[PDB]
Design a protein around this ligand. Sequence first.
Ligand SMILES: COc1cc2ncnc(Nc3ccc(F)c(Cl)c3)c2cc1OCCCN1CCOCC1
Ligand SMILES: [Cl-]
Length: 302
Amino acid sequence: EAPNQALLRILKETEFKKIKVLGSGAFGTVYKGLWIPEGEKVKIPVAIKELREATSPKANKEILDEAYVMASVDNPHVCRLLGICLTSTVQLITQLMPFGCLLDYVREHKDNIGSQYLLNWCVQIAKGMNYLEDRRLVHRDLAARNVLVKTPQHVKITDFGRAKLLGAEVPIKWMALESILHRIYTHQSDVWSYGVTVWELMTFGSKPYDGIPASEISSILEKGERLPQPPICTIDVYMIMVKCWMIDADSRPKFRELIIEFSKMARDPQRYLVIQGDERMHLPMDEEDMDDVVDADEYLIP
Ligand SMILES: COc1cc2ncnc(Nc3ccc(F)c(Cl)c3)c2cc1OCCCN1CCOCC1
Ligand SMILES: [Cl-]
């Protein structure tokens, strides 16, 4: 393995400004904020992740692993760590993803999301994932809930809580069978969860195996049962979902294949997804001083 020269950047608590809350519950408490690097005359919209108030040592070992992973990734369809703040408790800082989690976003906008968007998202996520594969990370927690929306046209994979290097050492409904039965995890098991992620999108945010309790899942999945074909889905699109769910993990698509297929499909989006009222579908920030606002994507350091 090659040296990981990712630069971990530590940031003074005084570099943040306005800080409203966005997410609570579980370990979570995620805030919206503003980060003004040094004397640099840029304001950077940021999200800030604490693993609760109670700074109990167990939590910090988990959050620091996350930081290590997020600090190591560099690609447009994957969220990067801007740095950390060593306050009383540990804070992760990352580019604010203004439109939130993709899951909530599809739920929130069923009526105005069209085929081009859905297919483009699939393309972008297959890219994020192929990027991780190159850097040999197994994400282990791909789901619509862990995909964030920079703009309706730009999605990025986040939440590296469970990311690991291939061959190292619990959301059941997104997990490949080998993972549920043997804790085997591979790029190919990520593809399984990719399958499920796609299904969440094609159903505008349904819950996978709604009603069935997580303990039964591997039983069902052995019987040969899979998620049903979503209404908007041609067999072409659904057959791709289904291949993500083969028992033989090597018989599953590669993320590189997924990019190509979804890409082809996104050139003629009405031939693959049937959405009522499709074509006529158009989708789309809080301070007077916005002169100096720079997206993190345009904020680079040598
Ligand atoms: C405007 O909304 C967000 C922007 C975000 N921008 C960047 N990152 C977010 N989350 C996040 C995820 C993992 C991380 F390590 C860090 Cl540092 C941040 C963000 C989370 C955001 O909302 C968190 C999700 C809010 N919902 C609330 C309802 O239930 C699902 C989650
Ligand atoms: Cl679950």
